[PDB]
Swiss-Prot record:
It comes from Homo sapiens (Human). Coiled coil: none annotated. Residues 6-136 form the Galectin domain. Its main location: cytoplasm. This is Galectin-3. GO terms for biological process: eosinophil chemotaxis; epithelial cell differentiation; innate immune response; macrophage chemotaxis; monocyte chemotaxis; mononuclear cell migration; mRNA processing; negative regulation of endocytosis. A motif (Nuclear export signal) lies at residues 114-129. A major expression is found in the colonic epithelium. It is also abundant in the activated macrophages. Expressed in fetal membranes. It is found in: Cytoplasm; Nucleus; Secreted. A beta-D-galactoside binds at residues 69-75. The modification Phosphoserine is found at residue 76.
Amino acid sequence: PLIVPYNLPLPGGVVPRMLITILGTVKPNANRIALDFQRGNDVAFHFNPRFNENNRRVIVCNTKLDNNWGREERQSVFPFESGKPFKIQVLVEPDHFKVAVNDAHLLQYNHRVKKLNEISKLGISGDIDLTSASYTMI
Ligand SMILES: OC[C@H]1O[C@@H](SC[C@H](O)Cn2cc(-c3cccc(F)c3)nn2)[C@H](O)[C@@H](n2cc(-c3cccc(F)c3)nn2)[C@H]1O
């Protein structure tokens, strides 16, 4: 397994047709997971499954600019389960990140940070065993 938190460089940033794939297994009794597509200190796209927020499961997405979080986008469809292996696919499209989990479409997140070629790191954090993180062009 890879060391968590893990930093995957994205050389030259992201671009439409770039597909990022994360494989791992959620820990027992997991509380949270986060993917952070970063532009320097800014977080262009934070994808944050919460397993116990007031005894509810929710996916929170947001952007952090100049150290400030913006408006959250929340998805109640929650395809993760403690103890189970998962695949997250993030496909960069012209106007949004498109996310599928275990081959099922989950959500889209419109680009707030527009300099896609400057979003050149992916951080992976939280309560997982990380198997692999990689990218390819489709
Ligand atoms: O915005 C994203 C940030 O959120 C803050 S928590 C703010 C609360 O969500 C704000 N809020 C919303 C509502 C509300 C929404 C709708 C209806 C209504 F009635 C109320 N009430 N309060 C988190 O710390 C922040 N973070 C998470 C992590 C993090 C670090 C390592 C692993 C990991 F997995 C995760 N690092 N930093 C980020 O996830």
